[PDB]
A paper describes a structure:
In order to form the ternary complex with the physiological substrate, the nucleophilic cysteine residue of the active site (C153), was substituted with serine following the strategy employed by Didierjean et al to form the ternary complex of BsGAPDH. As observed with the BsGAPDH mutant, CpGAPDH C153S mutant possessed low but definite enzymatic activity. Although a racemic mixture of L- and D-G3H was used to prepare the ternary complex, only the D-enantiomer was bound to each molecule of the tetramer. In CpGAPDH subunits A, B and C the substrate binds with the C-3 phosphate in the classical 'new Pi site' as defined by Kim et al. The phosphate oxygen atoms form hydrogen bonds with residues G215 (N), T154 (OG1), S152 (OG), A216 (N) and T214 (OG1). In subunit D, the phosphate moiety of D-G3H occupies a site that does not correspond to any previously reported phosphate binding site. The phosphate oxygen atoms form hydrogen bonds with residues S153 (OG), H180 (NE2), T154 (OG1). Upon substrate binding a significant change occurs in subunits A, B and to a lesser extent in C in the region from residues 213 to 225, which includes the last residue in a β-strand, two residues that connect the strand to a helix, and the beginning of an α-helix. However, this stretch of the polypeptide chain in subunit D of the ternary complex remains in the same conformation as in the apo and holoenzyme structures. The position of the substrate in this subunit is clearly not suitable for catalysis and may represent an initial (Pre-Michaelis) complex. However, structure of the ternary complex of CpGAPDH presented here clearly shows preference of the C3-phosphate for the 'new Pi' site for binding.
GAPDH plays an essential role in glycolysis by catalyzing the reversible two step oxidative phosphorylation of D-glyceraldehyde 3-phosphate (D-G3H) into 1,3-diphosphoglycerate using NAD (or NADP) as a cofactor. GAPDHs exist as a homotetrameric protein. We have determined the crystal structure of C. parvum GAPDH (CpGAPDH) in a substrate free state (apo), in the NAD-bound state (holo) and in a ternary complex with NAD and D-G3H. The asymmetric unit in the crystal structure contains one tetramer of CpGAPDH with subunits related by 222 non-crystallographic symmetry.
Author numbering:
A (entry chain D), B (entry chain C), C (entry chain B), D (entry chain A): 2 to 339
The structure:
Amino acid sequence: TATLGINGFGRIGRLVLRACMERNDITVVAINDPFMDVEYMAYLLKYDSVHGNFNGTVEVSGKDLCINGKVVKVFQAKDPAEIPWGASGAQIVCESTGVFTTEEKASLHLKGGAKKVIISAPPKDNVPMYVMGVNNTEYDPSKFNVISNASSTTNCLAPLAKIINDKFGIVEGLMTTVHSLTANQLTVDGPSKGGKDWRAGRCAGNNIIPASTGAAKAVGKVIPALNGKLTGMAIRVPTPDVSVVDLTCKLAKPASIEEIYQAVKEASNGPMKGIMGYTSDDVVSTDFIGCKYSSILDKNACIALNDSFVKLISWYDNESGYSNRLVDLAVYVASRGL
Amino acid sequence: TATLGINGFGRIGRLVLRACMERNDITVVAINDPFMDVEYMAYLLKYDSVHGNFNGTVEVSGKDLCINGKVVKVFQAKDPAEIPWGASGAQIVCESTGVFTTEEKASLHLKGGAKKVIISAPPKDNVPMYVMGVNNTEYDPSKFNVISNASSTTNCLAPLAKIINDKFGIVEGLMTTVHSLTANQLTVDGPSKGGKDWRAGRCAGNNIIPASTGAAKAVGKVIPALNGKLTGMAIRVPTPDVSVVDLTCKLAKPASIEEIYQAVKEASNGPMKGIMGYTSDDVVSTDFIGCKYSSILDKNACIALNDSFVKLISWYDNESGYSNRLVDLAVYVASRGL
Amino acid sequence: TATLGINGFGRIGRLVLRACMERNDITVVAINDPFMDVEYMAYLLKYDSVHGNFNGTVEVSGKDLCINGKVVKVFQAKDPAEIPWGASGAQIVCESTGVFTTEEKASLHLKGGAKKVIISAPPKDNVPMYVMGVNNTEYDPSKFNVISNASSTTNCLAPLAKIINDKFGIVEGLMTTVHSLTANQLTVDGPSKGGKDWRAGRCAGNNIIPASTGAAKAVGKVIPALNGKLTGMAIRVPTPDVSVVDLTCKLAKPASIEEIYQAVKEASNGPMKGIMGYTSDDVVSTDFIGCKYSSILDKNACIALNDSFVKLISWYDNESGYSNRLVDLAVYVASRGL
Amino acid sequence: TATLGINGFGRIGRLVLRACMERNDITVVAINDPFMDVEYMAYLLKYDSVHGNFNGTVEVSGKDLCINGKVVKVFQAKDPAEIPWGASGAQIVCESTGVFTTEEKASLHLKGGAKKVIISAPPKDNVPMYVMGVNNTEYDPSKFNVISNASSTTNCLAPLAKIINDKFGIVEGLMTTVHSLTANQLTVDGPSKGGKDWRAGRCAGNNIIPASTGAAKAVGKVIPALNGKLTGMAIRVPTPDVSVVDLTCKLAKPASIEEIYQAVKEASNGPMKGIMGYTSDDVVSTDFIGCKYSSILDKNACIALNDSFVKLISWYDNESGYSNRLVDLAVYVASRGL
Ligand SMILES: NC(=O)c1ccc[n+]([C@@H]2O[C@H](COP(=O)([O-])OP(=O)(O)OC[C@H]3O[C@@H](n4cnc5c(N)ncnc54)[C@H](O)[C@@H]3O)[C@@H](O)[C@H]2O)c1
Ligand SMILES: NC(=O)c1ccc[n+]([C@@H]2O[C@H](COP(=O)([O-])OP(=O)(O)OC[C@H]3O[C@@H](n4cnc5c(N)ncnc54)[C@H](O)[C@@H]3O)[C@@H](O)[C@H]2O)c1
Ligand SMILES: NC(=O)c1ccc[n+]([C@@H]2O[C@H](COP(=O)([O-])OP(=O)(O)OC[C@H]3O[C@@H](n4cnc5c(N)ncnc54)[C@H](O)[C@@H]3O)[C@@H](O)[C@H]2O)c1
Ligand SMILES: NC(=O)c1ccc[n+]([C@@H]2O[C@H](COP(=O)([O-])OP(=O)(O)OC[C@H]3O[C@@H](n4cnc5c(N)ncnc54)[C@H](O)[C@@H]3O)[C@@H](O)[C@H]2O)c1
Ligand SMILES: O=C[C@H](O)COP(=O)(O)O
Ligand SMILES: O=C[C@H](O)COP(=O)(O)O
Ligand SMILES: O=C[C@H](O)COP(=O)(O)O
Ligand SMILES: O=C[C@H](O)COP(=O)(O)O
Ligand SMILES: [Mg+2]
Ligand SMILES: [Mg+2]
């Protein structure tokens, strides 16, 4: 049985834990977050403004947590090299702080006894990115101890892009993601951390906010065939969770929406089971809260100008979908030998 | 001096009156809305959740309103034919109820003595649509008594699309508008009137909602050279006002974002003054509340995959910009001979 | 097994159905809503913006619904007298349209063969109101075929007010409910139905809105001793569901927050089991989404100025709590003989 | 004519500057904020998600700001003792960081050459609190160099409470402020600064949140006659600005709503001109955006159980009202002799 440690018990951290508690093939044994004592961790696990009450029991046992009868070790270290992952029995670390997105910083977990690290974001350096159901089998345990699970937007775009490119071929494409607000945004107009993303510091609750994203370009790394063929941007909106990819692309081979839907349907029921999904219902964002899929094609929202120029709409719970993929990746990493 | 009568004193109706009160070449003399008495009309004009307190004075005088010391006649007729526009001295009618969008229905205003009618929406029939700064000079007063000012999204897309098509040429394009909520949407999950737009009946405050726009369906009629070359959809978001056009197009002639920006700049400073605008600041939706422009290019938000495949971002206050254009059109109609 | 018909398949109607599907002692056999065809009904049951996906199977069977294998007859009558409740097998009718809140109107269901009617609101006339755990045993089947379940705020206030009046006595009290938005409110500034409530017609998503509450007049009818001793108002806020009672009262006998907490705890574990609840956690509104209790005392939020003047805080899911009580009442009504 | 320096260029900091720009008897000459450079300061002043575009011109002139032709010196010091206020010619410092709320910390501005300091919050120590129109004349320049303008809620509650206590007498009272979100709240579920106030770290956009208010302890210090007779709490809601005081109190002398309204009217037109206001319109929160008053009585929303037990409703723009008062206090302080 694979074991997990979580660094940064935030939106992704807590939902990764929730996903692990639902599974027999992986166990959470340790959590680290210096901005959060044990009682606070219990509170933030028990209660969730988006995903409801924790399904199970959460108690404080001295310095640690007792979750569903299992002991989970709790630490409050600011530096990753201070956390005793090995002694806690944690083989794999979910690096979900948002502040250690390089090999240099994320590899500090290995000093504490960790065997492997998964950065819950695209890296700032050349740490390899893997998307489950797309390129995860490319992972080489002899060459990497620190890997990345990319972004939730990449996890939404890449499986759809693979299906479309395999079947019809993408000549060129531009993506917008209409994305729910995140932790780096602010409740009222203020300065963004580092002063880099000025728009992201504007009142999150009443604004439509343009944003940059490398997600579409990152698909060019996950799927080398699409290097230089895809890019895009983000538009941030006041909703607390769930986002949607809007992909406008030109196809090398003509295809109708129905044919695109069928290609997605066959992948969803076959090689991309549990990763790619589809719907023909009149869905809205809240309908996907808690959805474990990486990408859900919205048939009725797709539009075609002609047989070669199309706009594809795909949903994703940026919190829940991604968290389940990270857990999938951890389980897969363990199966390849630690 | 043109005189205006307003049918449907709603979001557009009330902001059209506000735009008139700012101008010396047009006067509002009559208002009809059967779902609000004079006291209620006074209240809804005085107070606005988006555009602030009315700039001036509003008083009830008997059965009518006194706005900035001027008498404005008030009626409560469900039937357009029953409104005495002529006896009230109203030459042009702003048809902004949302329920009389055909020549057959909108022409009923002519029975009461109105000379011309402007439908505040795209028509359900073949009523001619005009967009200020694009095709408005094509209006023939001897041919048409009922015209349309199209939609707010059309007024955003058409000026930009014309500029791009003229200098670079649009081979093919697809658009999305990330659009603020409107009066037809619902506060909680319920049935949409007529039971047609199921998604639009879902809780507006916490949902990202795919929708229709018919704006590129309208831009093709306003700019015949683009008919069949553009289509689009909408994504409805919880914000109370201000929307954004996201236009992804292939260009006939290669162009950089800088060159595109320069073309928009030249049009904004010349033939499309007051209609097309541009910015290089890190703006968000609230920054455009009250903005009178039809279309504002967001330079920093635009992205290009290559020299001939681009995603262009243009803002619009769907309430304020459109209302100002409708008043512009009414003044223009009056100048052509009533 | 009691059988239920639902008139008005709205927020309350649908959640009443959901509450029944969770139960073995009551079954929904018929639904009536003229503004909603059977396909739309299926859609609105399947998907909920607050309470998630329907847990079960919903299919259209002719003009009727098939839910978890059972046929639920569907009608589209505007006139209650035209609904064949008897032929459908429906014993008790949930009157949840919001427009038939008198004995004269609600008794029309009896013409179609229904035995009993529960109005899902305070009546406009003298139809008796019952609150589970407070006065429901005063119901007399030989006297009344039409009854009321009061309001959600009444169901929150009444159990708490009873506990306080029994143990300590209420000299006088004033309350406010900070209340989530409802169906009667509007997405943008517009006219409310009729002359009623101008404030309620203001943009729901960005306003704090003073309002009225049914519990102001209902509480003194449910607990006659408090008639003239207790009244209040509402403050409407942008949240989609869950509300909170803010009760400020003078006690006839000295009591601390601890003593008040204990009295509530005793009632919650005794005669008001499943109805009155309590918490000592740092809860917020979303933590109560789906909560079945009528009233949950928030210990940490309560404040005492002195030993006889106190502010009590009590949560309630205005949709889920009330819907469960109406079903509780229906089961109780059937147990008394139809 | 006073000169002002601003420490902490946040919501209050920037709106204090905006208030100053509207007046000719006070001038901002310096700003310190280590979390934003001069370009970022210019951006956050120019654009506001609540209060609109800045009325005037904002230019970056090398190191410093040029606002309406006036040079404003810009600093980036974390330590208040390192800011050269004297060299910049700043007489009075607006201490609006939220982190220097003691005499020991706030008096550090005097080291850099400032003459007086106004903390934009209730102090953690015994620094004297003043509310304009309530107790500001008790200020003596020969006694204090460091003072406090209390809080926004204190500035709403105190004038109202004074009027009622002077006219009728408050025996006992409890209040709640339904309060817009602030900078200390979070966009999604997370850990609050420090480690306490867990509820304030919950998703601000979709929650009703019990909270603390500065006015609970401050009101009894500003009006000593009400010490131990008045306290309360806050309820935080998703709106970006504007809050409302809900005051439930018992009176020593019988008084109707009309009599209370007339007493407020007298004060508003007399000793509390520009501080206390009143309305009989069906107002909602957005109607007070930019309102300069400290407290606006909502006549229609007030309720009386009997002639001596009453609930009073008073609005305030927590940003605009308070900011104008701090500027009023700075001007008053200057008039008394620096
Ligand atoms: N939609 C999403 O939220 C989403 C989806 C996919 C990936 N991600 C990525 O996952 C990462 C975290 O995202 P999030 O939304 O959960 O942010 P978050 O703010 O909710 O969680 C971050 C947690 O890290 C903790 N932390 C900060 N410094 C730490 C340290 N030095 N050591 C240990 N813990 C520390 C913080 O206390 C916080 O609880 C980011 O890289 C983000 O880009 C986010
Ligand atoms: N962003 C926008 O809101 C926007 C922008 C451009 C165009 N439009 C179009 O303008 C029209 C109105 O839009 P809105 O947002 O102002 O809607 P609205 O609901 O705010 O206003 C419609 C008004 O019409 C009144 N009305 C209904 N029946 C009437 C009748 N029989 N006679 C007179 N008045 C009647 C209603 O009482 C209401 O006040 C629609 O066609 C809409 O598509 C809207
Ligand atoms: N928090 C709440 O939502 C809440 C809580 C307690 C009680 N209530 C009360 O319950 C009632 C319904 O409230 P709601 O929030 O569900 O409103 P709603 O608008 O969501 O539901 C009302 C339903 O009644 C239907 N309807 C209208 N006329 C009808 C008719 N003639 N015949 C059959 N159906 C008709 C409408 O189509 C709609 O689906 C109201 O009386 C309300 O005061 C509401
Ligand atoms: N409704 C309100 O916002 C409101 C109303 C009345 C009073 N207040 C009080 O006013 C103060 C500021 O509140 P705010 O809402 O403007 O918060 P804010 O976060 O918007 O502003 C605080 C500013 O202080 C700056 N800052 C932090 N450390 C600094 C330092 N060491 N030196 C100089 N600047 C520093 C931050 O960068 C930020 O720009 C708080 O004490 C608050 O309680 C707030
Ligand atoms: O957490 C902030 C990230 O920008 C979210 O992006 P993502 O949803 O693409 O991972
Ligand atoms: O609500 C309607 C829009 O403001 C008008 O534009 P659209 O319908 O073309 O998107
Ligand atoms: O929607 C209204 C409430 O849920 C019902 O209770 P109230 O009317 O007594 O506040
Ligand atoms: O807007 C007000 C500030 O957030 C603090 O005020 P308060 O603590 O007195 O409510
Ligand atoms: Mg991303
Ligand atoms: Mg059942």
